[PDB]
Structure formats: C-alpha cells, structure tokens
Write a protein that binds this ligand. Structure first.
Ligand SMILES: C[C@@H]1CCCN(C[C@H]2Cc3cc(O)cc(O)c3C(=O)O2)C1
Ligand SMILES: C[C@@H]1CCCN(C[C@H]2Cc3cc(O)cc(O)c3C(=O)O2)C1
Ligand SMILES: N[C@@H](CCCC[NH3+])C(=O)O
Ligand SMILES: N[C@@H](CCCC[NH3+])C(=O)O
Lengths: 487, 485
C-alpha cells in the first residue's frame, strides 16, 4: 500500500517472464469496442445470454471484486463507457491455465483482452462473460479512487490519471475539439481557405507582447517566436486568397494567469471586401450557433466565481450590445477627452482619474495603455448576463486598423468580452501604405501592401478562453492537456 | 523599368487623393464573385448581352490592352479564375469622369470594382461589361511579366501566387490533402488533440532541438521534435484513438527535402499491431491519390522539370522488404548480432567504402545501418511506394521487439522515390525493456501505469505533398519557408 506495491508488481512481471508467460502480448484481435457493445446489447432480457455469438473485447479493469473464488466481478472501461465482467469458473475455457491462476494475477488498472459472449445478469446488469482472459498490459502503480483526485495539481502534471477517473475532464476535452471542428467547418462553409504560416520569424509582429528567442545552429540566426499570425495571413490575401484562415498555437512570454498561458491556440481569418458590419454579423452568428450546437440552447450556466459559488447565466442571443470605448468612458466619469489623446491636456486628465479611483498606474503612461486600463475597469465587467462588444477603438490603440468612415480619431475595431475577458478582436485592415504608422512590423509586410491589399477585415479568436466559459471552468490549465508547469 | 514606376505610381495615387478621389475606399459591397460569375453565365451565346441584369464584381487586373480607344480589354482574376472585361464605350457612364482618364489609370495588378452586366464577347469569351470601374487597391510596383524561376518567389509568396497559376494549384491540394487526412481519421473514430510544443525535454525522434528561454520561470525549454511521447500518454488516459496534425521543430540541415520546421501528423491506434498499420497506410495512400486525381498512377519529375518524369503506381498492396535481410543479400555479407559489435561495425564500415559511400559520422550502429539502407534499398525501386520493415532494436528505442525475429522490431517505413514519407511501428509498452527507463522520467512513469498494446504511425505532410504536386524542393510546398536575409 505505501510504496511496496510498485515492487511486487514489478517482480510479478519478472516472475511471468521467467516462467514463460509473456506479460505484454503483441496483438489481441478484438472484434467489438465497448461503446458499440453498449449500443448493440442494451435492451437484452434480464438473465438472457447470447451463447452462439462470441466476441473479443478489450478494456481496463477499474474494480476488482470476487464472490466464492469461482465468480469474479470486474468493471471494464473503454472510450469513456463502462461494462461489467462476470467471470464464472464453469464458463472458463479450462485449457489456457487454471481459472484461479488466470484471474488472481490481474488487479485494478490492468489492460486485459476478453474472449466471451454478451449477456445480462439476473440483476439486470449488461456484462461480458469471458471464457478466456489474457492480460495485455499491467498497471504497476496503485490507481487512486474516484474522488481521490481532481484536487491537487496531479491533473495538470499527469493528465492521463485525470482522464481515467473524472468524467468531467473527458467531457471538457471532447467539447474542446468539438469547438475546433465546429469552427473549422464553420469557415469552410463560407468558402474560407486553411493555410499554414511559419512560427519562427526574424521579427515579432502581429500584436503587442513579449516574444521568445531561439537559435538555428546550421544558420546562426537568433529567431523570434510568433505572438500572432497577423502579418503572413495578409500577405496571402495579396496573393489572391480572398477568404483565408489559420488555426494554430501562438507564444507569449507574459505572466501566467487563469486566462493567460505561455502558449495557446489562436485563430485568425481575413475576409476580403468585408466591412465593420460583416465582422459583427459573423461573430454574432458564430458564438450563438456554437453554444446551440453544443448545449441546444443559447443560455448556458457558468460558475464565474469557481465551483464554490453560484453560477451566472450567460445568454448568447444576438444581437450583442455594442459599446464605444471612448464614448462610454467619458460618460461614466464625465471626463471629456478631446483628441488628440497623445496630447498633454488629456493624457493626465485620465491619469487624475485612474490614481484617483485606486487603480494601478501602467508604466509607461502612454495614451494607448491608459485607455486600456480605463476600459478594463469601467466597461469590461458591465454585461455578464450576455457577451458584448467594445467597438470604435482609438487609432492610437490599434495601429493596424483602418480609419473610421466618419468619426475622426477612431477606427472600426471591435472586441467581444465574455464575463469581462477578451475573447475576440477584429477590425477592418488598413490597406494604405502612406497612412501607415510603422513603415516610417517588418518590411516584408510593408512591401506586401505596396503591391495592393483589397479592403479587408480581419478577426482573431481566443479558443483557449472560449472553452473556459463553454465548460464551466475558471482556469486555463483545465482547458488544455499539458499546461506549462514548474518542476 | 526600375523603381521609377513604383515611385511614379506612389506619386500618382498621391495626386488622386489631392484631386478628391479615394484610392482606398472603405467598403464596396460586391454582389457576386468571379468563380460564381463563371459558373452562372457560361452557357450564353457568343455576343449575347444581358443588359438588364447588373452586378457588382471585384478582381485584380492582370492584362491591359487597347483596341481603338472605344473598347478596353482586361483580364480580371479572382480566386484562381479569370474573366475578360469588355469596357464598351457605348455602355460607359460618362458622368463619373472622362472615359479616357477612367481607364488610362488602370494598370496591371490593380484591384478594381466593376458595376455592369454579364455576357459573352464578340469572339466568344465570357466577359463583364462595366458601366463604371473604381480603383480600390493599386499595385504600385511593376508586376513581373515568365522569368519567375528565381529565389524571390520564396520570400514573396504573394507574387508567386498571382503570376504562377500552377503554384496556387499545388497549395490548394496541400489543404485538400490535410482535409482528406483529418476526415480519414475522424471517420475512423480518431480524436484530435493538442500537445504542448514547448517541453522540458525534446523526445520522440533523433534530431537536434531548438532551445528557447522563458522570462517568467527563467529556465530553458526545448521545442518539440516529435509529438510521440505526449500522444501515447493520452492512450494511457483512455483515448484509444488519438492524433494531432501539427508542426514540429528540428534544428539541422536545410536541403531540398529538409526544413527546420515542418508539418507532421501522428495517430496512435490502440489494440492495433504491425499488420494493422500496414493496411492503414496502403488504404490511406491509395484513397488519397484516387481522391485527388481519379487514378492510382501518377507522374512525377524526379530528376527535375527538364528531365523525363517517372511514374508512381499507388495501387495496393505495396512491396515490403526487411532492412537487415535485403542489405545482406545485395552485399553478400552476413551482419551477425549485436550490430554495434566491433566485428559487425567493421563490416558495415568497409562495405560502404567498397562501393564508395561517405561515412556518416559518428560511425555508430544505427547510422551505419541507416546509410546502408538509403544507398542499397531506397534507390532500387521507384515505380511504386514500398515499405522497409523489421528494423533492429538499436535503430528504434521506442519500438516493440519483433514477436518472432529476435533483435529486430515491428517497424515499417514507406518510401516514395527513395524518400521517407511515413514511419510506423508497434509501441514498446513494456517499461522494463526500455534501456532509457533507468527521454525523461515523466514519460517512463506514464508507461508504469499500463500502456495497452498499441501501434503508432507518423506522416510527413510536406514530403507527401511534394510527390503529389510534382515538386523537387520542399520550399515549393511550404508557403513561407525559412529564408536567410
Ligand atoms: C489572438 C487572440 C484574440 C482574442 C484575445 N486573445 C487574448 C489572449 C491574450 C493572452 C496573453 C497571454 O500572454 C497568454 C494567454 O494565454 C492569452 C490568451 O489566452 O488570450 C488573443
Ligand atoms: C514524423 C515524420 C514521418 C516519418 C519521416 N519523416 C521524416 C522527416 C524528417 C525531417 C527532418 C527535418 O529536419 C526536416 C524535414 O522536413 C523532415 C521531413 O520532412 O521528414 C518524419
Ligand atoms: N491578430 C489579432 C486579432 C486579429 C485582428 C484583426 N486582423 C490579435 O492577436 O489580437
Ligand atoms: N515520431 C515519429 C513518428 C511516429 C512513430 C511511431 N510512434 C517520427 O518522428 O518519425
């Protein structure tokens, strides 16, 4: 029980090897899985056995029970579904070892191949009746019980233990790929095209973050890891790919939070001849149909304050509330910020309302980062009953967004927030090389615009944050398999 | 013409802004795309006009030709398809400006917005009849008129995708291949996942890894060379059918068939053996080739686009050869075990020099066998893909020992024109038989909880698209490959 269980099971493998019994066989020819076994023999008669249809099935023993040395009860799991094993001495093929020698050797956690027939016990339990039982691979360690996990960080370290004990985690991850599959098929329906852009570049462009640094030995270059796929995707639209998208990982060297991770899955599409309204119409259709594709209703339950407090209802019914960033800030505080924002009359007009409201000052106090913290404390945690948009950002905050059609100083940028956390960022791209801020971003992108970029609108998604709200999870390490951990 | 055209056009759009014309308008809503335009109005009569059905279309001009200053001819390209522009003077709206100036400004490469009606040309071409054309995005640089076989096509792919209609046909099939692969595995109950690309140790293959540093934890991490270890750990977790189409990073040479980062897919099939992996690859490759072309045989310019092309027959089954057996037969020598013994190493050292082959340093057991297989097995059959099977355990640290032949494993490698596009074997699920479980301890411990008998397979997506798109270099199937400044 302490640590000696790892020793005798290890010697048990050696005792089987010396006696001539190979403990890890090569191939077991199973003819039926467990989920299909459940679907095929679900409505059998209580006590009915199908003796003429023998089946070969595999699985992992999760409960070892006995009753008289000649009747042994097991729990065989596989692909998230569970059936019972009713090993009876009279049904055992008395030609491959003794019954006791064939069943006293296996314990909890062992992968075993079963040769038997389907049937239901008198208690009404669908079970497989093995005439032959062969150990495929033994579990040398002591597996914890049901509620002996999902507490410590052993899940984030050894996820294979968390996937075999808690039905939640398996449901968290089958819904994660269900989202990615729904998102991939959603774009393909609109004629989008999936591509692959490089991840090791000589410049860190696309967003605002802190990059990584690696080195190529055969070339002697110190390359930067990407933070987004903004620049290469636009170059492909110049190449004729009007509808293009890409799903993949992006790297960030920021602080690790419950919504922040060193690496996470990104998704950016770029729609040619699409304006500001085409994006919000695309966003409201995507999130609404997604939660309806999963839960059958636009209203979902989500414990915002951990599993210890009551949840809050998140309504995904379009249209979502649109909010202007500069217009809402100057109303809740009645501090009129006149453009230009990078002046000196207004840059401290908002400094005297961030330290006056007991909020951390962001250094450097640039007009772009001041409006960011002002929006993060006055607009973000506004509508938790339903997601909302923060639209019409200033041009100081979005150096890659096209000028607004009428309103000066602003742009057509939009950010969707769920429970106050950004999960979407979209704007109409700035296809003017002369009205650009950075070309006076690498030259590979500045030269790409000089060849002609159509009026394009882009959008980025946070899939790792989306799965958090769509699975009632509060941490970023719950929605990814192997999060970065400290030894 | 040099940069003067780019600098004259840069001033040309500057004057257009001063005159009061926006060269980059915000929105111009189009009603129908160019591919939809062809699929609808193709069955018209030569010269038939539909002057009542007006449409809003967009595209990029790739051809400018004058003809009597009354009819202007253009080639509008959009989404890999082309249409003609019949700018008849009688149909032009003269209120929007001078008909001469409204079309003398349109150069090659400009993105324009056309408002007009469909129909066929006088000669019989499907054309669009613009009532008015408005420039939305101007191409300042001169588009290369086709003298494109240089090196700039790798650094500036957007130029290579507009001028060469052939390269767009190859990158569209690379997506169709991945779309076929994902659906192939998903239709077989496989469950796609995502393993972290930044691991504490690089494992799963045999290559030098890239190493970066995190600024919050202040320890150096290794970029993955293969998703092998994190995937089979999910097999221990209950996912009996798991795969991951993604990217890996290997820090080594850059040749026509090697890139510092490439796309690879690896699926792990529980309760499947070596015979199940051979049947899968034979089925997957034959169905993929037939899905793209309609036949199992294809043509491929192995020696280059100028030399004669060879044919590849993807009709299953494919030949299988044991690596240790065929090497002994072609060189008439016997390589007794152990393969890393001084006597066997010496024989492998000499045989490659009797036939004048370079020595792959370091002269080890695996390196000598790997070189002995590339210059004696992979270059003998090119008409069909073939499997090189039953590798020694010294060449495969993670492959299960052969169930019948001692000293070997149940490995299989598929080759096309002598290049490895696939690798598979039954996974070694015995934690004691691993020489290295005494790699990382975080993976050997996962085997201690019981790994069922499974069989994994790896695919080289970038190499597979090469032989299916008739490309000699791997940089031709990658959008933006690694390029030196
Ligand atoms: C491209 C998308 C657009 C939608 C918004 N997200 C936000 C992104 C920010 C972030 C920073 C970080 O260092 C670590 C993170 O895990 C995250 C994260 O998960 O989310 C970005
Ligand atoms: C997992 C797959 C399947 C099994 C075989 N291939 C081989 C892989 C090796 C490689 C190294 C490199 O530095 C660069 C490369 O492009 C490649 C490549 O394209 O192919 C690996
Ligand atoms: N790349 C942006 C999202 C897309 C913006 C519009 N092209 C980001 O990382 O937030
Ligand atoms: N990781 C292997 C492919 C899978 C081999 C079977 N586990 C490679 O890079 O070649």
């Amino acid at each position: 029980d302490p640590r000696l269980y790892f020793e005798n099971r290890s010697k048990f493998i050696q005792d089987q090897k010396d006696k001539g019994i190979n403990p890890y066989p090569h191939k077991f020819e199973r003819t039926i899985s467990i989920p299909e076994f459940i679907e095929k023999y679900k409505d059998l008669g209580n006590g009915e056995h199908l003796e003429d249809t023998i089946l070969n099935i595999t699985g992992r023993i999760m409960r070892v029970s006995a009753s008289g040395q000649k009747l042994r009860f097991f729990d065989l799991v596989g692909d998230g579904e569970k059936i019972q094993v009713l090993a009876n001495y009279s049904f055992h093929n008395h030609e491959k070892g003794n019954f006791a020698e064939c069943y006293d050797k296996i314990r909890r956690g062992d992968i075993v191949g079963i040769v038997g027939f389907p049937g239901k016990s008198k208690k009404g339990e669908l079970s497989i009746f093995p005439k032959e039982t062969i150990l495929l691979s033994a579990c040398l360690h002591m597996l914890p019980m049901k509620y002996g996990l999902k507490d410590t960080e052993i899940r984030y370290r050894q996820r294979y233990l968390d996937l075999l004990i808690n039905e939640s985690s398996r449901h968290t991850f089958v819904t994660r790929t269900k989202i990615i599959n729904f998102l991939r098929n959603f774009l393909n329906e609109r004629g989008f095209f999936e591509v692959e852009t490089p991840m090791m570049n000589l410049i860190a462009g696309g967003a605002n973050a802190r990059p990584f640094i690696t080195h190529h030995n055969d070339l002697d270059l110190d390359l930067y890891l990407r933070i987004a796929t903004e620049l290469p995707l636009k170059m492909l639209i110049v190449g004729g790919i009007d509808k293009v998208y890409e799903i993949g990982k992006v790297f960030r060297n920021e602080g690790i939070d419950n919504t922040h991770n060193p690496e996470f899955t990104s998704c950016e599409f770029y729609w040619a001849y699409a304006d500001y309204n085409d994006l919000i119409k695309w966003s409201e259709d995507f999130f609404s149909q997604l939660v309806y594709h999963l839960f059958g209703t636009y209203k979902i339950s989500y414990n915002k304050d951990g599993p210890e407090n009551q949840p809050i209802e998140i309504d995904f019914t379009p249209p979502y509330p649109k909010v202007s960033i500069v217009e809402e800030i100057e109303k809740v505080t009645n501090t009129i910020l006149e453009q230009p924002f990078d002046s000196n009359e207004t840059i401290e007009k908002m400094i005297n309302i961030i330290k006056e409201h007991k909020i951390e000052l962001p250094n450097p106090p640039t007009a772009a980062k001041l409006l960011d913290q002002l929006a993060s404390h006055f607009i973000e945690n506004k509508y938790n009953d339903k997601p909302f948009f923060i639209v019409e950002h200033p041009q100081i905050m979005s150096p890659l967004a096209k000028y607004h059609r009428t309103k000066p100083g602003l742009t057509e940028r939009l950010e969707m927030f769920i429970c106050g956390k950004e999960v979407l960022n979209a704007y109409t791209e700035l296809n003017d090389p002369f009205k650009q801020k950075e070309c006076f971003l690498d030259s590979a992108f500045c030269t790409s615009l000089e060849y002609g970029l159509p009026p394009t609108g882009g959008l980025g998604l946070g899939i790792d944050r989306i799965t958090m709200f769509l699975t009632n999870k509060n941490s970023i390490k719950d929605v990814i398999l192997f999060p970065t951990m400290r030894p």
